[PDB]
Design a protein around this ligand. Sequence first.
Ligand SMILES: COCCOC[C@@H](C)OC[C@@H](C)OC[C@@H](C)N
Ligand SMILES: [Cl-]
Length: 341
Amino acid sequence: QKTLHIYNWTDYIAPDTVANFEKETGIKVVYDVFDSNEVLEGKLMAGSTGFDLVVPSAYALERQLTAGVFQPLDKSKLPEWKNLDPELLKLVAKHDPDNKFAMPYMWATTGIGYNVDKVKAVLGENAPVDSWDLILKPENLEKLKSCGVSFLDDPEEVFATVLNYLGKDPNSTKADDYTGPATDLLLKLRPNIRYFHSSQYINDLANGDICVAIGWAGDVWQASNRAKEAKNGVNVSFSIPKEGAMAWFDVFAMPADAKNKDEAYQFLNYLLRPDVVAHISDHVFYANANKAATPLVSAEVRENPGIYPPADVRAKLFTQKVQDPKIDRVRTRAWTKVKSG
Ligand SMILES: COCCOC[C@@H](C)OC[C@@H](C)OC[C@@H](C)N
Ligand SMILES: [Cl-]
């Protein structure tokens, strides 16, 4: 009896995906979760994770490759690899040349999740729900403080969105951008932010406990779906703001010391099956990278422009750059200053 260990994001799989895999293959699966790239990268850099598959973002995969923490995917053991989107593969290939190490899993954006009715009650029906002004303008955050504001606990996301909102390069390589105007705005916003967290905001949005969040798109639509299932009358939506937004790709990768490579390949081939990965998108409200699976995804998910955004919305998106150690230092320092007010 072999056991496959999988380290994935929270709220990032269907409730029966793993059980259906165990039944089909006889492989026992141990499934652990994280809600942060730095948590996952920390384990990948510090020692032996014990995981056979992990799921980092494509840009973070690039940093991890330079340390040799992954092993190349044997394409002959992934016969269904052809189901993956070539335009999505080419986008991942900027971080993983020739797509040698990673399998694109899901992709989405980083925008604003919000309580529609409470926002409209606090800021009126003309609230800037189409703009980052909703959560990055201090005059607005001062009004929304009491209903609850959350930011992701992710320095790269927050700083990229703040610099973009200030008219700077989202991936600015000038330290004065981070210590100056980026830190200045965050400190003005900081007293109105209830907490920095990358997963608690899902149930807090669903229950009406926070009214505006920096959120990952599928996370927020899950919040909206849970509230509807609970019949609590809470109205949650998601905005890809008109100023542009962070877009990203999460990929499956195989750690270089993975114990059960053969079983890991079996799970990757399982994920490549169109019905399997469409079932996941139906439940997590995330776009998968499987071109063959798209028609099998629910109309509710596929026709949602906040999940499968149209071309006008795609033209506004930017992706995360791997910053050199100088900018990494500056950004990380300012982030810690910001978290402690
Ligand atoms: C409470 O969770 C029990 C998991 O049960 C797995 C079910 C679906 O069957 C698949 C089995 C035969 O394969 C893996 C075995 C070794 N655990
Ligand atoms: Cl990415």
